Amino acid sequence: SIFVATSFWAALGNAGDARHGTAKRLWASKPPVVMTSNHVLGETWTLLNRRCGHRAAVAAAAIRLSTVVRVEHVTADLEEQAWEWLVRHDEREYSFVDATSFAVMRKKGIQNAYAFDGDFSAAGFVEVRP
């Protein structure tokens, strides 16, 4: 299984992203179980909206309708763990969505992330490469 982060969705959903081709390659080779979070989709919307405008962002909104991609609603319990995690890990700059993403992966026993730019790698997960 894999967990998909915003950095990946943003690449996949933006044809003008420098890592678009890499993303599509990764997407074609993905395992059957693909999950992400409500926080990630929201972040993806915002990023794609700011970068490519409303139409491109609508694509991200539609992922929540997918029968193939599993979207975890991050619970209050999981968020509390993410907050605690965030407060202790001052060694590197981590976003809130990243911390909730790590928390989801730990909960679901997921080690592989579809993500770029090394934050998941730094946090002890595997950022899948083509």
Add this chain to the structure above:
Amino acid sequence: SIFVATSFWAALGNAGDARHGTAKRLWASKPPVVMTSNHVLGETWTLLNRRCGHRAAVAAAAIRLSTVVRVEHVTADLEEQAWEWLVRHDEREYSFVDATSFAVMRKKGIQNAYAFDGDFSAAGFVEVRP
């Protein structure tokens, strides 16, 4: 009676923000009932962590512990309402967090927002000023 957006927290939590002065004055004259959301606090963490560093971002994390600020966990239902709203409103660039913020306010019957930049005003709310 008021909902506090990310833009306000970011100004209040960063003394170098151009609207920090306005934020503190509004914060001094705020009503007894003050509300925000998990999404907003998460976004605030991320912004402050990038701009001012870990120690400053921890302040935002601590708001979730407040006995005076009500922190609403945005339900999957409210997010769905936010998603449908986002898809509908192409006339202006709206973030996901702001969309969920609008949804929370509408459900709670709140129109007065502690927020800057006019996005809440555009969405039909009152961005309160001193």
